[PDB]
Amino acid sequence: VLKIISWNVNGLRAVHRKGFLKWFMEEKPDILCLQEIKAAPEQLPRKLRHVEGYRSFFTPAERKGYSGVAMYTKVPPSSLREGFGVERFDTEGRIQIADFDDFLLYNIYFPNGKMSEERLKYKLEFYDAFLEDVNRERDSGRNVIICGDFNTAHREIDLARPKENSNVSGFLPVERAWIDKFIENGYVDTFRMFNSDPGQYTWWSYRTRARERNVGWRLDYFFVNEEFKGKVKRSWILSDVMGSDHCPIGLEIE
Amino acid sequence: MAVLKIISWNVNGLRAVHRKGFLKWFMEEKPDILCLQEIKAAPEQLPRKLRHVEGYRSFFTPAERKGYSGVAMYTKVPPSSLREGFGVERFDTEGRIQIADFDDFLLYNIYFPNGKMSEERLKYKLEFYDAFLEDVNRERDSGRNVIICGDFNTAHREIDLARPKENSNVSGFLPVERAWIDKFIENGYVDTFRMFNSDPGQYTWWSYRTRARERNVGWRLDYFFVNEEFKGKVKRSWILSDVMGSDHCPIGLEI
DNA sequence: CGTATA
DNA sequence: TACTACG
Ligand SMILES: [Mg+2]
Ligand SMILES: [Mg+2]
C-alpha cells in the first residue's frame, strides 16, 4: 500500500512560505516527487533539506534558480540515476530515476516548449531520449512508474480551451502524437483508468486568475507499464491544495 | 588632441533605457564616443533602431549569461581593433571588457564586478581589479596612452558617498576596495573628475529602494581615469546628473 | 525597487 | 501573473 505524490511546485522556497511542510505533514506520502524546485540545496532552509522520516534527494539545474527536481522517500532506493546519459538533457535539473526494486520510479520535469522553436525541438528530443530509456528498462524486465510534469495535454478533454490552443505548444499535434506513441509502447495513463470526466486539470495560468474559473490543462500524469497496471488502486488529482500554478497528483499502489 | 567628446553610462538595461527615450538623448548629446555598461542583452535581442545608429559604428560585448552584465560602445570613428578580454577566461566571459584602440589612446570601457551578494563575488571583484591593473600597466609601460572609463563599483574617499560611516562595512566602500583605488592611482593614473572638481555631493549612482536620487543620497561609482602622461590632454570631466533612465547617470570627458 | 523563464 | 537572479 504505497502512496506517491507528484507536484510541480513552482519554486520550493515559494511553497515553503505558503506552508508546504504543513501539507506534507498532513498528507503522509511514502514518496513525494517535486518538479521546478528552482533552487540549489544550499539555498534551501534546513527544515526543507531534511524532513523527519524521509530521505531527501535534490537534482538541481546547472543554471541557478531554474528547473530542478526533488524526491522525498520514507524508504531509500537502491540507486538514483540523474540522467539519461545524454549531456544536453542531463544538466537541466529534470531527471530522477529511483530504483525501489519492485519498480523504477521516474520523476521528470519535461521541458516547456512555449518560448522558442529551438526549445520545442529540445522538448521533442527529450521525449525521444526518455522513451528509449524507459523502454530499455521495461524491456530488461523492470516495472516502471513515471510521474511528473509532461507539459502537454493529450486530448481535447484534457484542457478547457482545446481549439484556441491547437497552435500553442502544450497542445500541438506533434506533442499529442508523442503521447499516443508513448502509450502504444505499453504504458497507461493511470488517471484515465479511474476517471473519464472532463474538467479535470492540474495546471492553470496565473495571468487570467484561471484557477477559480477552472480554465486549466492536465499537464501532470502518473504512468505505469501495463504489466504493472494490476497494482494501481487509485490515481487522483489533489486539486484543492494551493501554492503553485500546478496542483499535486496522487497514485496508490498494491 | 582637440575637441573629442566621450560619455560613459551604466545604463541598467539597454532595452530599458530605450523605452525611456535613450536614442533621443543620444541625438541631443552628440558624443564622439559612447561607452555603455550593463546592457543586459545580446545584440539579437536589441531593436534594429539600436544596433544601427546613424553616424556611428556599434560594438556589443554581451555576457555568456543571458540578460546579465554586457558592455557596448558607439563610435563616430572606428578603432584599429577591439579586444574583449584580458586573456583570462573567468574574467573574459562576463560581458565586462571593451578595449578599443584609437591609436592616440586605448579606451577601456569596463563594467567592474559588484561585490555585495557574496564573499566569493567580492573575491572575484578584487581579482578582476588585479587582472585589470596588470593589463593597463603592460599597455602603458609599452608606451600607449590610455583612457579608462566605466562602473568601478567603489567610491574612493569619504567625500565620494553621502553616507560613508554606515557603509564602511558594505562592499563598495570596504577598506580593501578603497585601498585598491589608492594603489591604482599610485601606479600613475588620475581620477579626471577630481582634477576639475573637489566639491562633495557629486554622485553617479543612487539606490532605487529609497528613492535616494531626489534626496541626493548617492555614491560616485563611475569614473574617467587617464595615465598621468596624458593628463595634459583632458580639458573637461563632468557628471551629467540631468539625465534619467537608470540608477546611474552618465559621466562625460572632453579631450 | 528595478531589469531581465514559466 | 510569479518565482528567481542580481544589482
Ligand atoms: Mg510552473
Ligand atoms: Mg545598475
Fold classification of A1-254 is Deoxyribonuclease I; Chain A (3.60.10)
Give the CB-side neighbour count of residue B4, counting CA atoms within 13 A: 16
CA to C1' distance (Å), from A167 to D4: 29
Cell numbers representing residue B137 in the block? 600597466
3-class DSSP state for residue A124? helix
- B106, B73 Cβ separation under 8 angstroms: no
CA-CA distance, A78 to B214, in Å (whole number)?
A: 62
Out of 3.60.10.10, 3.30.450.40, 3.20.20.70, 3.40.50.300, select the CATH number for domain B1-255. 3.60.10.10
Cell numbers representing residue B84 in the block? 574583449
CA-CA distance, B253 to B255, in Å (whole number)?
A: 7
Instruction: Express the helix, strand and coil content of chain B in percent, nearest 5 each.
Output: 30, 25, 45
Question: What residue type is assigned to position B69 of the chain?
Answer: S
Residue nearest to nucleotide C1 (CA to C1'): B209
- A246, A220 Cβ separation under 8 angstroms: yes
Which positions ≥6 away from B248 have C-beta within 8 Å?
Answer: B9, B10, B11, B12, B151, B204, B205, B221, B222
Task: Give how far the C-alpha of residue B217 lies from the chain's centroid of Cα atoms, to the nearest Å.
Answer: 20
Task: State the ligand closest to the CA atom of A34.
Answer: 1
CA-CA distance, A32 to A24, in Å (whole number)?
A: 9
B49 touches strand C (CB under 7 A): no
A14 touches strand D (CB under 7 A): yes
Q: Using a 7 Å cut-off to protein CB atoms, list the covered nucleotides of chain C.
A: 1-6
Closest nucleotide to A209 by C1' from CA: D1
Closest nucleotide to B248 by C1' from CA: D7
Please write down the HEC assignment for all residues of A56-123: EEEECCCCCCCCCEEEEECCCCCCEECCCCCHHHHCCCCEEEEECCCEEEEEEECCCCCCCHHHHHHH
**Phi and psi angles of residue A136, each rounded to the nearest 5 degrees, phi first:** -50, -45
Catalytic residue check, A102 = no
B238 touches strand D (CB under 7 A): no
Residue B182: Cβ-neighbour burial (10 angstroms; 0-12, 13-18, 19+): exposed
